Each structure stands twice: as C-alpha cells, then as structure tokens.
Amino acid sequence: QVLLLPFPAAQGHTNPMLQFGRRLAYHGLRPTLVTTRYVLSTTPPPGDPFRVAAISDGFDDASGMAALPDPGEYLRTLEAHGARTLAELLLSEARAGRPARVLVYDPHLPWARRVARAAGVATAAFLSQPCAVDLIYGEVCARRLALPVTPTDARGLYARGVLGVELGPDDVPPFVAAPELTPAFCEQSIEQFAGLEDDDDVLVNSFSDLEPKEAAYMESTWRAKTIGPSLPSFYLDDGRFRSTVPCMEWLDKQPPRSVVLVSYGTVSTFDVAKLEELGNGLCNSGKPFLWVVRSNEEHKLSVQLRKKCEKRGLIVPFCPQLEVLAHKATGCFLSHCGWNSTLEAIVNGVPLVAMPHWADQPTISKYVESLWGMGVRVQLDKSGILQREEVERCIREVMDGDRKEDYRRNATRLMKKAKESMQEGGSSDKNIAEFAAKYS
Numbered sequence: 001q002v003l004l005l006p007f008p009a010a011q012g013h014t015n016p017m018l019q020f021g022r023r024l025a026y027h028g029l030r031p032t033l034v035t036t037r038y039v040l041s042t043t044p045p046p047g048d049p050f051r052v053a054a055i056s057d058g059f060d061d062a063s064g065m066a067a068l069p070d071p072g073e074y075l076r077t078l079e080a081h082g083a084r085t086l087a088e089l090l091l092s093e094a095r096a097g098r099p100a101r102v103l104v105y106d107p108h109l110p111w112a113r114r115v116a117r118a119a120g121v122a123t124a125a126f127l128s129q130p131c132a133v134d135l136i137y138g139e140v141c142a143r144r145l146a147l148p149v150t151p152t153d154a155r156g157l158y159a160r161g162v163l164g165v166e167l168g169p170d171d172v173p174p175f176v177a178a179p180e181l182t183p184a185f186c187e188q189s190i191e192q193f194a195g196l197e198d199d200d201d202v203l204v205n206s207f208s209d210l211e212p213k214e215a216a217y218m219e220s221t222w223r224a225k226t227i228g229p230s231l232p233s234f235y236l237d238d239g240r241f242r243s244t245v246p247c248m249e250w251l252d253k254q255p256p257r258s259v260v261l262v263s264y265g266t267v268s269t270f271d272v273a274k275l276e277e278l279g280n281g282l283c284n285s286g287k288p289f290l291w292v293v294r295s296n297e298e299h300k301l302s303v304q305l306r307k308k309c310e311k312r313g314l315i316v317p318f319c320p321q322l323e324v325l326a327h328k329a330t331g332c333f334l335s336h337c338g339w340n341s342t343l344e345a346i347v348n349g350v351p352l353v354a355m356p357h358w359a360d361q362p363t364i365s366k367y368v369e370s371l372w373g374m375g376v377r378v379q380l381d382k383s384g385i386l387q388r389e390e391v392e393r394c395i396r397e398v399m400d401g402d403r404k405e406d407y408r409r410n411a412t413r414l415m416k417k418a419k420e421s422m423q424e425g426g427s428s429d430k431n432i433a434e435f436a437a438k439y440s
Ligand SMILES: O=c1ccn([C@@H]2O[C@H](COP(=O)(O)OP(=O)(O)O[C@H]3O[C@H](CO)[C@@H](O)[C@H](O)[C@H]3F)[C@@H](O)[C@H]2O)c(=O)[nH]1
Pocket: 010, 011, 012, 013, 015, 128, 129, 263, 264, 265, 266, 267, 268, 292, 317, 318, 319, 320, 321, 322, 337, 338, 339, 340, 341, 342, 344, 358, 359, 360, 361
C-alpha cells in the first residue's frame, strides 16, 4: 500500500498527488488517498485505482478552516488531531493486512513525517510548488539566509547559478520577504524543510527543462526529483476527455483562440472594488471571456457588472479548467499563477496574463514574464491597486501585441518540453519509474 496525504481540502495539493498515484498504479502499486473525515463525508471518492482512508483535523462535521479562519490556529489543530489520527490509521491499516509501504505527504504537514517514521513507514515528501520558490525557503530553513530574504540575497543566488532569474522586490516570495504580514505561512513554508533530509525520497511537481538551474540545485541539495507536470496522461499525449459541462458548449461556439479564461484560484478572496476593476477590465477588452467566480464570492458581484459581462462573457462558479485550456477557442489565461494553473497553461500552450496575490505567485509571475517569455504580469498602481485599464491593457498586449507571437512561441515551446518530460524516457518519467521500483 502507498498512502497519499495532500494538504486537506486544498485542490492545488490533491490533483497532482492523485496523478502521481495513477502512475504508481500503472506500475503495479496500490494507492490510497488519505483525507479528512469532513472532506470524505462531503466529496465523492476518487475511485479506481484508489482506496480512501480518513484522518481528522478536529472538524469532522464542519469545515475547520471556516471555523478557525486564523491560519496558525487551524494548523495547530490539524497537527494535534491529524498526528493522532494518522498514527491510528497507520496501525489500523497494518492490522487490516494493508501495512503502508510508503507515505507520500505534503510537507506543509511536517508532522506526517514523524508519525510515519515512528510507525516504521518510509516517507516521500511531495512538493507542490516550483523549485525556484522551494529552494529559497530551503535556504532559510538551512540557516544559510536570514529572515527577511531580500532582493540582494536573490541576486547572490542568481550570481551563483542557482536561480535563473534575478528577483526584484515584487518577485521575491512574500512569505519570507515580508514575514510580518503572514507569520503562520512563513513558518509553514520554512518548516517544510525541517527534517526533510530524513526522508527516503523527496519529489517535486515540476520538470527540469522548465527550471533547469533550480531543479538541479534542489536535487543536489535536497535529493528532490522532478515528477511533473503531474497531470492526466491524456493532456501530456502519453498513450500508455470531452465533458457535458455547459460552459464547454459556449466555448464550442467561439472562434479559435478568441477567449480569455479568467480565474484567481480557490483560496484568495477579492473585495467588491477589486472584482469591479477585474470585470470591467474584461468587458473593456472587447474579447470573449469565461470568468470563474466561486460560489462563496459571487454575492460580491453587482447586478450591473453581471449584466455588462453578458454581452460576450460567461461567468461560472467552477469550470473543468484543463478541458478549457485544451480547447481550440481559448486564446489566453488571466490567472493568479498558482503553480497548478501555470503548469496546466504550459501543458496546453496557453499564454498567460499573470495577476499574482501571494505564496509562490509573485515568483512564478516573474518567471512567466522574464525567463519563460510566455506572458506578461499586471502592474499594480503606486498604492497596490489593480486598475481596469491595466487589466485591459495586458489582455490586449497578449492577444494583439507586437509581441503576441513571442508569448505564443514560448508557450508552445514549453508545452512540448513538458510533454516530453512525462513521456516514456523523459526526465520526470524516469524519476517516477525509479520510485515505483523502489517500493515494489
Ligand atoms: O474552476 C476551477 C478552478 C480550479 N480548478 C483546478 O484547481 C486547481 C487550482 O490550483 P492553483 O495552483 O492554480 O490554485 P490554488 O490551489 O489556489 O493554488 C494554491 O496551491 C498551489 C500549490 O501549493 C500554489 O502553487 C498556489 O500559490 C496556491 F494558491 C487547478 O488544478 C485547476 O485546474 C478547476 O478545475 N476548476
């Protein structure tokens, strides 16, 4: 048995780990998704070839995140209850005749390691953020960089050939460049790396052609092996689809490369004025657009703005984002540049307009714009606000610019390297097959 333990609830942690698990099953391993009782009760299971098992974060009936909006407080409770119930699960599983061969875990759950190790179970950390950000956190954890991290430290990393781009103040990861803003997330980001060297394996959802210096450093410093992009094999053109979702039918009616997909992710919240600038920007661009506005956010949307969006947009609460990104009508993606989103754009060859909020997004956005060349980043005004004119300018810059073809050329180029990495003999595929063999 292979246990897979993502950060619970966090869809940006769970899909990639599930896809890695399908490849393990292809090689003969048996994967089990481990998740909270709440999420189990309130979500269909993944299905074959996965078993499911449960632990508790304390809130088996309510959402604990909702209950404990203070993040330090939630993490503390997840740790107390998760660690206890994971220990219980490792024993109950052995007693049922399914002893865990390895626990693959998100090291945003640092406690998972100690519990597995004390139960005698091999451990494999699964990093779901890019090498470039991972390694900076790593440098802090290893006491080679002090907090706060500065553009000067970043420039040393670039000068040493470790980072492939020079990060300015808006590009350094804010959790360690401005730790005061987010104390719990700083500590969580850094503590990923505490004890990592005791792991049997360390894995990262990226591919080495995308971040070659950063992946090489992560490997020689932390034994990190690239196993991504961890996406369904169909999108990767890997031989060894079409849904009925209504928004796909709308998209079927649009001309080729005409549509802007717009999504700011599952976590971040936008206030009314910010939604107003984003949505007016979209309407003002004159492009068709599929704008994802979550159920828990849509009450911030005025009737007027909503009516303006009807002329050539469609607003939905959720879309099948991979399917949309693979669709012929889709011309670019205005994205917060979460890592999962960015990798999905890359595998589909879709150029990006980046509008980062935090975590790894500012750094990712800088790579998009400078090293990868597959898009542009929105420039906030002097006081930190995104204006509708900037949203509109960037959409039009990517879709009608003199550099329209540069963004497309790079996105296509990187699409092909991403597919190669995950096909048989590719750099990521090889690390997957090695891991598979190790535990079979
Ligand atoms: O309508 C929808 C909306 C989303 N999805 C899918 O949900 C996932 C969103 O992941 P992404 O990394 O872009 O956003 P999120 O989990 O906020 O990322 C956090 O977690 C990431 C991983 O640690 C991190 O890089 C990032 O900074 C964090 F914000 C991605 O697989 C989408 O395809 C969808 O299918 N339909």
